[PDB]
Design an enzyme around this catalytic site. Structure first.
Site, PDB file in Angstrom:
ATOM      1  N   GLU A  11       0.661  -1.252   0.194  1.00  0.00           N
ATOM      2  CA  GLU A  11      -0.023  -0.018   0.222  1.00  0.00           C
ATOM      3  C   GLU A  11       0.795   1.157  -0.097  1.00  0.00           C
ATOM      4  O   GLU A  11       0.487   2.356  -0.425  1.00  0.00           O
ATOM      5  CB  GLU A  11      -0.900   0.015   1.252  1.00  0.00           C
ATOM      6  CG  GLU A  11      -1.839  -1.248   1.333  1.00  0.00           C
ATOM      7  CD  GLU A  11      -2.961  -1.169   0.367  1.00  0.00           C
ATOM      8  OE1 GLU A  11      -3.185   0.158  -0.445  1.00  0.00           O
ATOM      9  OE2 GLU A  11      -3.871  -2.121   0.188  1.00  0.00           O
ATOM     10  N   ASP A  20      -6.838   6.354  -4.785  1.00  0.00           N
ATOM     11  CA  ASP A  20      -6.224   5.011  -4.918  1.00  0.00           C
ATOM     12  C   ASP A  20      -6.423   4.597  -6.010  1.00  0.00           C
ATOM     13  O   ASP A  20      -6.581   5.417  -7.092  1.00  0.00           O
ATOM     14  CB  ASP A  20      -6.889   3.973  -3.797  1.00  0.00           C
ATOM     15  CG  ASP A  20      -8.273   3.696  -4.186  1.00  0.00           C
ATOM     16  OD1 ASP A  20      -8.656   3.871  -5.210  1.00  0.00           O
ATOM     17  OD2 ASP A  20      -8.620   2.830  -3.428  1.00  0.00           O
ATOM     18  N   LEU A  32      -9.119   3.487   3.228  1.00  0.00           N
ATOM     19  CA  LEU A  32      -9.960   4.087   2.390  1.00  0.00           C
ATOM     20  C   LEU A  32     -10.880   5.134   3.064  1.00  0.00           C
ATOM     21  O   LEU A  32     -11.383   4.940   4.177  1.00  0.00           O
ATOM     22  CB  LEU A  32     -10.876   3.007   1.745  1.00  0.00           C
ATOM     23  CG  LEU A  32     -12.048   3.859   1.087  1.00  0.00           C
ATOM     24  CD1 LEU A  32     -11.429   4.452  -0.498  1.00  0.00           C
ATOM     25  CD2 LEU A  32     -12.982   2.663   0.599  1.00  0.00           C
ATOM     26  N   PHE A 104      -8.119  -6.844   3.404  1.00  0.00           N
ATOM     27  CA  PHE A 104      -7.460  -5.515   3.943  1.00  0.00           C
ATOM     28  C   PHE A 104      -8.072  -4.738   2.449  1.00  0.00           C
ATOM     29  O   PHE A 104      -8.337  -3.550   2.347  1.00  0.00           O
ATOM     30  CB  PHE A 104      -6.135  -5.310   4.109  1.00  0.00           C
ATOM     31  CG  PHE A 104      -5.505  -4.015   4.464  1.00  0.00           C
ATOM     32  CD1 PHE A 104      -5.335  -3.061   3.416  1.00  0.00           C
ATOM     33  CD2 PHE A 104      -5.537  -3.710   5.845  1.00  0.00           C
ATOM     34  CE1 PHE A 104      -4.780  -1.828   3.835  1.00  0.00           C
ATOM     35  CE2 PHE A 104      -5.099  -2.290   6.257  1.00  0.00           C
ATOM     36  CZ  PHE A 104      -4.935  -1.278   5.296  1.00  0.00           C
ATOM     37  N   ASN A 132      -6.757 -20.264 -10.414  1.00  0.00           N
ATOM     38  CA  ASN A 132      -7.939 -19.830 -10.448  1.00  0.00           C
ATOM     39  C   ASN A 132      -7.968 -18.263  -9.905  1.00  0.00           C
ATOM     40  O   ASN A 132      -8.823 -17.486 -10.213  1.00  0.00           O
ATOM     41  CB  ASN A 132      -8.982 -20.546  -9.599  1.00  0.00           C
ATOM     42  CG  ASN A 132     -10.332 -20.226  -9.304  1.00  0.00           C
ATOM     43  OD1 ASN A 132     -10.903 -19.635  -8.565  1.00  0.00           O
ATOM     44  ND2 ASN A 132     -11.106 -20.662 -10.547  1.00  0.00           N
TER      45      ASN A 132
END
Ligand SMILES: [Cl-]
Ligand SMILES: [Cl-]
Length: 162
Positions: A11, A20, A32, A104, A132
């Site tokens: 981050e 972001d 956020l 997160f 996947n």
């Protein structure tokens, strides 16, 4: 390496409100603020979160405090989640860090939507789970961060972060 250092690499750290990768108002270590387009709607959420008039800027300490709350909430949400909990419980310590990272970033709801991959992780079918996991908007949008998390799930080591 631990979850904190891992997420701090994924981050980054920013002391001023920023947008972001999806274009939402964020601050600190991936905290956020709001999905609203309003920079004011964002300054207000920010003040509410810090308990002071920030004028869009916080100190390192404040960022770290938000960050400690967020990891804690992430873990607690996984533990309260019927689909996530059993996956987490099944995993070794490194891989639990990987699951926490996804939560997160994308919220419990989002991760819970990877039904098929979660089933593979639970069965410890590592290579299949890694394939996947890559069939997702997540991987297409943030391929470098996704590859790190995915490698962590495939290997059970911190190599991608070394
Ligand atoms: Cl908050
Ligand atoms: Cl990325």
């Amino acid at each position: 390496m631990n979850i904190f250092e891992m997420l701090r690499i994924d981050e980054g750290l920013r002391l001023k409100i920023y947008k972001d990768t999806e274009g939402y108002y964020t601050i600190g270590i991936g905290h956020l603020l709001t999905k609203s387009p309003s920079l004011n709607a964002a300054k207000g959420e920010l003040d509410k979160a810090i308990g002071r008039n920030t004028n869009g800027v916080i100190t390192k300490d404040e960022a770290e405090k938000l960050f400690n709350q967020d990891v804690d909430a992430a873990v607690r949400g996984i533990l309260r989640n019927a689909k996530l909990k059993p996956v987490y419980d099944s995993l070794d310590a490194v891989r639990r860090a990987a699951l926490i990272n996804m939560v997160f970033q994308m919220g419990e709801t989002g991760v819970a939507g990877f039904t098929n991959s979660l089933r593979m992780l639970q069965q410890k079918r590592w290579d299949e789970a890694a394939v996947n996991l890559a069939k997702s908007r997540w991987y297409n949008q943030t391929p470098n961060r996704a590859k790190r998390v995915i490698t962590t799930f495939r290997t059970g080591t911190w190599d991608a972060y070394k």
